[PDB]
């Protein structure tokens, strides 16, 4: 019931995320010099050391926020890629599903700590 658990597991989990292959085009901000229409289609550029720094400044309350900018980097690959078939957009498949599996019992956990306090 510790309602503060869910920084340091979220430090571990980006932790693993940067040793993963899959996360290299995701760790800095997409290179607009080598994609240069980005901002015509992504309105609100994310990658990892971003959520990284907002974490570690203490600037997320819940470990909800984090999984919100966490899925933001998904769903921007999803409408850049000019196909589903594309190696980036499939690394970012393969991302995704890694980093639901483990995001699921932080959550529990910290929604459980909530009611436990509110009890
Ligand atoms: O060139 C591609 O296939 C492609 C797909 C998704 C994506 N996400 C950020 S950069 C990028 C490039």
């Not at 990658?47 to 819940?62: C, H, I, K, M």
């Not at 196909?83 to 459980?112: G, N, P, Q, T």
Request: glycine share 0%.
């Amino acid at each position: 019931y510790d309602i503060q658990a869910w920084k340091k597991q979220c430090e571990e989990l980006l932790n693993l995320i940067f040793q993963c292959e899959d996360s290299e085009p995701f760790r800095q901000p997409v290179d607009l010099l080598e994609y240069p229409d980005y901002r015509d289609i992504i309105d609100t550029p994310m990658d990892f050391a971003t959520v990284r720094e907002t974490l570690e400044a203490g600037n997320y309350e819940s470990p909800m926020e984090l999984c919100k900018d966490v899925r933001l980097i998904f769903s921007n690959s999803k409408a850049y890629t000019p196909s589903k078939r594309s190696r980036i957009y499939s690394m970012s498949l393969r991302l995704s599903a890694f980093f639901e599996e483990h995001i699921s019992s932080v959550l529990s956990d910290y929604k459980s700590a909530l009611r436990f306090h509110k009890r």
